[PDB]
């Protein structure tokens, strides 16, 4: 069986902010919050992923206040807290879930200082997390059908001849959002779950389920809540339409992040 | 007879190359062992000899044909057949030396090179690094003919080593990485030849370490960062499997889940 390590790491999420023990106070019950990612050895942003499914900062446990949607997440002594309230699973699609409650770690607002909570899982941007020491999103070109490049043009998105154009650069944030490099307040967005809905660029404000994406091992870019993938409509770039569409795997649904 | 997958450079397209690489992956591993959504090749421990290898038959415009043999446990080329002669890289140990005796049994001439099939020795024998050996349909065509004529006295050793470097990347590495496969599809799509950029080189160099970091990660988070390179020289670190899911398609087996 493989060794299970215990790496110390930051947890980056909504709008690229870091999971933070507020004001560096480790009193039992002090809230966990979003905060700009530090670049030092401060303990309140460095988390040990322990073998017992515990996530620890300065020796104390990331702990949910309860098992109902909307209760806050605190720091608490690992031995004193209810054991089930200290246990978490980090899923490969960016979800951090509390197994006992089946509720998911969330930042229901995007501002610095937002109190973290547990919410019902809807695979929204507000519930996307990444354990990493990288505090900057990865900027990349996204190549797709016929080797053409995903291109941002204000609200509209389409695929067009690649040319090393800031309109063709994309910031992959730790919360699962895909942001145009020129304006990181905005997000690749599907306004809804319906098949053939046109994907566009809108504000990352709502941090919705339509704004969260995962690059799958099969080359598709998946919207987790709907289960639909990005698709160059009719496999015709001239339509200038990128849509949500059920998975069929043909070349108009294959993408590659060329970093 | 071991499973055979065929590819021809004659009229090769993006699609025909994709079908080929997909087919190779389907015979390299069953796909039932998946760690963090990334397939794992079979464990060498427990793998019977009659399932140890797969065959990749390459042909070109001149209808020269050559058959590479791939170890399914690491997707790497261990040797090749051309006509009624077969050649093999110097095996690392005695068991791999025994295992290749089960390849191309019908062939009347069998030879083991004094050199292994690692890039470092192939590069010095070719007189050039991967960073300058162009890849694409054209180079694959020429690599096929050079491999074919090595039985004849017509292929000098550097050209042979260069042909190995071409086939290994365009077949084995593309099987290991969707990223490298997409790089090959870029060359085929535009009928261009191009040396691989540093991102491809570092991915090839890191494949073993990446497999270990992923399979021994704590829920995807690595114990230590792995340093990769962008397409320009720029270096960055990876701490989590999430960015590698669309990058790596196969891993060498390291340990049990």
């Amino acid at each position: 069986v493989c060794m299970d390590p215990e790496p110390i790491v930051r947890i980056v999420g909504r709008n690229g902010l870091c999971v933070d023990v507020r004001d560096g106070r480790f009193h039992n019950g002090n809230a966990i919050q979003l905060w700009p990612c530090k670049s030092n050895t401060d303990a309140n942003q460095l988390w040990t992923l322990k073998r017992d499914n515990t996530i620890r900062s300065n020796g104390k446990c990331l702990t949910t206040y309860g098992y109902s949607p909307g209760v806050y997440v605190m720091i608490y002594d690992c031995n004193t807290a209810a054991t089930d309230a200290t246990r978490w699973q980090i899923w490969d699609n960016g979800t951090i879930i509390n197994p006992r409650s089946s509720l998911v770690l969330a930042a229901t607002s995007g501002n610095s200082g937002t109190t973290l909570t547990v919410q019902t899982n809807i695979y929204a941007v507000s519930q996307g997390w990444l354990p990493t020491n990288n505090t900057q999103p990865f900027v990349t070109t996204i190549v797709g059908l016929y080797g053409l490049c995903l291109q941002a043009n204000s609200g509209q998105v389409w695929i067009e001849d690649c040319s090393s154009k800031a309109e063709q650069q994309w910031a992959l944030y730790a919360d699962g959002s895909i942001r145009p490099q020129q304006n990181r307040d905005n997000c690749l967005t599907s306004d809804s779950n319906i098949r053939e809905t046109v994907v566009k660029i809108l504000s990352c404000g709502p941090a919705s389920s339509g704004q969260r994406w995962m690059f799958k091992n099969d080359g598709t870019i998946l919207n987790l809540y709907s289960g639909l993938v990005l698709d160059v409509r009719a496999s015709d770039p001239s339509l200038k339409q990128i849509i949500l569409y059920p998975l069929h795997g043909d070349p108009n649904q294959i993408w590659l992040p060329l970093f | 007879q071991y499973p055979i997958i065929n590819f021809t450079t004659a009229g090769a397209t993006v699609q025909s190359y994709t079908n080929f690489i997909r087919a190779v992956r389907g015979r390299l591993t069953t796909g039932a062992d998946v760690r963090h959504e990334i397939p794992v090749l079979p464990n060498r421990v427990g793998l019977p000899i009659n399932q140890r290898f797969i065959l990749v038959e390459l042909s070109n415009h001149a209808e020269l044909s050559v058959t590479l043999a791939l170890d399914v446990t690491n997707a790497y080329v261990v040797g090749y057949r051309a006509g009624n002669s077969a050649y093999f890289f110097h095996p690392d140990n005695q068991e791999d030396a025994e295992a290749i005796t089960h390849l191309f049994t019908d062939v009347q001439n069998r030879y083991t090179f004094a050199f292994g099939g690692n890039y470092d020795r192939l590069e010095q024998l070719a007189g050039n690094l991967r960073e300058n050996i162009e890849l694409g349909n054209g180079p694959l065509e020429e690599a096929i003919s050079a491999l074919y004529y090595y039985s004849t006295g017509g292929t000098q050793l550097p050209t042979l080593a260069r042909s190995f470097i071409i086939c290994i990347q365009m077949i084995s590495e593309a099987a290991r990485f969707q990223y490298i496969e997409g790089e090959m599809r870029t060359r085929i799509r535009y009928n261009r030849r191009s040396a691989p950029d540093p991102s491809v080189i570092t991915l090839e160099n890191s494949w073993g370490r990446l497999s270990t970091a992923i399979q021994e990660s704590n829920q995807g988070a690595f114990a230590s960062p792995i340093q990769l390179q962008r397409r320009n020289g720029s270096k960055f670190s990876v701490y989590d499997v999430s960015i590698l899911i669309p990058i790596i398609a196969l891993m060498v087996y390291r340990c049990a889940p």
Partner: nanobody
Amino acid sequence: QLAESGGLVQAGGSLRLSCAASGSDYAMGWFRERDFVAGITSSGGGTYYADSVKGRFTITRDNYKNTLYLQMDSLKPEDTAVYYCKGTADGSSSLGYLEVWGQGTLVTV
């Protein structure tokens, strides 16, 4: 290369258009300015219809015969136009990909 065929009938009728290709690698679509009507991916498996014609038109393909179809049921005077076949492919151009058209077939309803 692509050539159309099968292009008059009253409102509410039926007509099937064919599209014979010379050379499966190609996504194919129908157009009728030129406007998108229907499209299908190379292997099939993805069919995408314009909103106007959805629920009335059926695009199909058959890559062992190299022919593309457009079934047009419940036609209206709104469908009267020149109907072109179109294909998109992987090669090099100013687009960055290939676009081959047809010569067009007239339909009047």
